[PDB]
């Protein structure tokens, strides 16, 4: 199927306490593989996946230099935005960045991403054509015009179509035993009485990868969308994910309810019942 | 692999 590579960046200014904290992480699909934290002793880009450790020291020096330069660029970006928005130098402000590429099963570029946010809302983003910018306000239009004169999009387009795709397929091959091995969810249904005629049916999905999955409850074949409680997909802590869905059913009508699990690691969607 | 670019706001 399709695959993706992503780099996330967060800069949080702490005025009066030193330089802003800079945390950046790299993801291939839903797998973390690189990280960098400015608050470390001597900060360097560090591996977080086994298939990325085989890269030489020239790889890790380059990724560390780029991480440090991104941190400095965000520092002076945060100072610049204080002038654009006429804000005080005493408050804390957040700068978020994300870029990366999506490829299909053939290994070709599906779409390129690069977008920035300031204080939780969109700031400026690279359009799908990898040539024009979308600015969220007149402050970001200042940045847009400078980036257009500096041809920033031309470097981003060349990277997203070139190095981003070439190195993504390299990561996917070196870690094919984990990045491409589907991990179907282990599923079951629990039952908890609430009163003398109301009970809960919870449908579990545990230890699956990737995180994309669908959990639906059906009564007599009818979809119970509005009557279903659904929790956010959560990480188990071992690169797998968990999720469950619950519905309140009348005591005695439990077998009329079916759970439907749709995951890419499953050959066919599962249909589960209470089954005491 | 990260991109190597300096694009100040």
């Amino acid at each position, epitope marked *: 199927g399709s695959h993706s590579m992503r780099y996330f960046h967060t800069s949080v200014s702490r005025p009066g306490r030193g330089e802003p904290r800079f945390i950046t992480v790299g993801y291939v699909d839903d797998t973390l593989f690189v990280r960098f934290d400015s608050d470390a002793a001597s900060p360097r880009e560090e591996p977080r996946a086994p298939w990325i450790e085989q890269e030489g020291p020239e790889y890790w020096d380059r990724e560390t230099q780029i991480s440090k330069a991104k941190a400095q660029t965000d520092r002076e970006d945060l100072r610049t935005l204080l002038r654009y928005y006429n804000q005080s130098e005493a408050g804390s402000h957040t700068l978020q960045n994300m870029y990366g590429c999506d490829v299909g099963p053939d290994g070709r570029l599906l779409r390129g991403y690069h977008q920035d946010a300031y204080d939780g809302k969109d700031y400026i983003a690279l359009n799908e054509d990898l040539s024009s910018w979308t600015a969220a306000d007149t402050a970001a239009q200042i940045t847009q015009r400078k980036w257009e004169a500096a041809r920033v999009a031309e470097q981003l387009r060349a990277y997203l179509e*070139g190095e981003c795709v070439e190195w993504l397929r390299r990561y996917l091959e070196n870690g094919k035993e984990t990045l491409q091995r589907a991990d179907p969810p282990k599923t079951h249904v629990t039952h908890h009485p609430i009163s003398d005629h109301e009970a809960t049916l919870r449908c579990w999905a545990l230890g699956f990868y990737p995180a994309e999955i669908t959990l639906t409850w059906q009564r007599d074949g009818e979809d119970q969308t509005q009557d279903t409680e659904l929790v956010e997909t959560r990480p188990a802590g071992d690169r797998t994910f968990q999720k469950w869905a619950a519905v309140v059913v009348p005591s005695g009508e439990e077998q009329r309810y079916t759970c439907h699990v749709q995951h890419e690691g499953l050959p066919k969607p599962l249909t589960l019942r209470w089954e005491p | 692999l990260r991109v190597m670019m300096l694009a100040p706001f």
Partner: T-cell receptor
Amino acid sequence: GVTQTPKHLITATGQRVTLRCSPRSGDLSVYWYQQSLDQGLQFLIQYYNGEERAKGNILERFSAQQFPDLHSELNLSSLELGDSALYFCASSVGLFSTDTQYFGPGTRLTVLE
Amino acid sequence: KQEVTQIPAALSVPEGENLVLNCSFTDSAIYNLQWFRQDPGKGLTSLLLIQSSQREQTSGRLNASLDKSSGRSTLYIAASQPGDSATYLCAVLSPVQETSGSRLTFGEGTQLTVNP
């Protein structure tokens, strides 16, 4: 575009000269380069909005500065015969890695005994 | 450590000939590579700027490639004219030490003479 003064300069050893540069209107960073016969075009120092940003193999007897109006000066003191070269000034919009630099005409310096 | 070498030192050719100008650099972690021309009297004029991730740029009769992993770049000048007579300088923008202070490093150049 970028202008430099003076265009030519003949000086003796041990003397001191100051070279001046006005960058393009709107550019915030200025650069200084030395083009010699033995070393070619060599980067000296860069300022950004009055603040030093990068530094090459500049000697301690060379001194530069960028003023609030963005124009820049370069002092060359204790001149030696090897200081005879073309000193170029350049400027750019700011701290981008994807744009070029714009160079002035240059200042030819000749140092005699 | 970053240093740039160009070949040939000089070049005297008949007009209309396709030209091949080579450039090598020792450090591959570059922000961009550029080709300048310097005419005696005027300073430098940027002809091409190849972005970090680009492999070629084109402007008129000029066409230059880039190979970071190999540390090589070739400028192609098609249908050379006497007006192209100048020194052609190869340059790379890159950081030198562990700082974001990027510097421009220049090669010695290729003095080109196109004879009518």
